[PDB]
Amino acid sequence: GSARLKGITLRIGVIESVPFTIVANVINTTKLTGYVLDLIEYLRDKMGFVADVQLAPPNTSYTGLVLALANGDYDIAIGDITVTSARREIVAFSNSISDNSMRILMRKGTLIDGMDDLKNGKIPYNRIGIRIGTAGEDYYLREISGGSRNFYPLKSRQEMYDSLLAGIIDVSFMDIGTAEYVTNNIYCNLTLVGEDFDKSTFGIVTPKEWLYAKDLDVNILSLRETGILDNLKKKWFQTKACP
């Protein structure tokens, strides 16, 4: 059957990723803001659930978040979470909240023209940094290395940026939204190269055969139709600090 989320408490898993989910230390506690938190508020206001927002532990991967939900740790998870076939085997996803694709990230001045350089072996595989438990890893294993885990593994975006800046790796992969955001606002010495790749979608993770699937989907689609999702994207992503 189906039912409405009105009155229900949802444990909502979120994962740090600026400007989707921004974690600020304050004194001492944490305050969450961002596209995701604003989305939650639009859904809460319309649907009437009580939002119990739970930030995933540091270094949790995207796959880890999904598995945690599947094991009953959260009721739903909201973020820049790519819909993939392996994930869909164990959880369901809402209608898409955003289109997505990936970009190559590198230091400015690095002699890389695009994905051909990665696939032709111009870069040593152990100098391609890949965050384990991400769709980027899925792409890498499918399209670059033929199943071999021969990349430089990364535990977080922060390790990615630090390793690029330190010259420990030469490239990595990011989703296009955050890729643009961080290269235009935080790391002025990092840049994007090549064509975008792996066109995909982000969706809200839910349990398989969830009682509340229809309620959530109708509401997401209504936010899409009425321009709210576009408004939130502009609010959080249309900024550029770097000169």
Instruction: Please report, as ranges, the residues that interact with a second copy according to CB under 8 A.
Output: 1-2, 83-85, 88-89, 92-93, 95-96, 99, 138, 142, 198-201, 208-209, 213-214, 217-219, 221-222, 224-226, 230
Residue 75 is assigned to a ligand binding site: no
- Give me the residue whose beta carbon is nearest to ligand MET: 62
Residue (75 or 100) nearer to ligand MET, CB? 100
User: Of 107 and 224, which has the nearer Cβ to a second copy?
Assistant: 224
Residue of 87, 128, 124 lying closest to 106 (CA atoms): 128
Q: Which positions from 156 through 175 interact with Cl ion, judged by CB under 5 A?
A: 174-175
Q: What span, in angstroms and rounded, lies between the C-alpha atoms of 51 and 154? A: 31
What angle is formed at CA 228 by the lines to CA 226 and CA 230, rounded to 5 degrees? Answer: 105
- Which parts of this chain interact with ligand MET (CB under 6 A)? 62, 80-82, 102, 134-136, 173-175
Q: Report the chain's C-alpha Rg in angstroms.
A: 18
Q: Report yes or no: 203 and 97 within 8 Å, Cβ to Cβ.
A: yes
Under a CB-based contact definition with an 8 Å cutoff, are residues 204 and 91 in contact?
no
Residue 92: its H or E element: strand 92-93
State which residue, 159 or 175, has the beta carbon closest to a second copy.
175
Q: 240: which residues sit within 8 A by CB, 6+ positions away? A: 184, 185
Residue 85 contacts which entry, ligand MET, Cl ion, a second copy, none (Cβ below 5-8 A, type-dependent): a second copy
Q: Is 143 in the site for Cl ion (CB under 5 A)?
A: no
Which one, 86 or 165, has the nearer CB to a second copy? 86
The binding site for L-glutamate consists of 80, 82, 87, 131, 135, 175
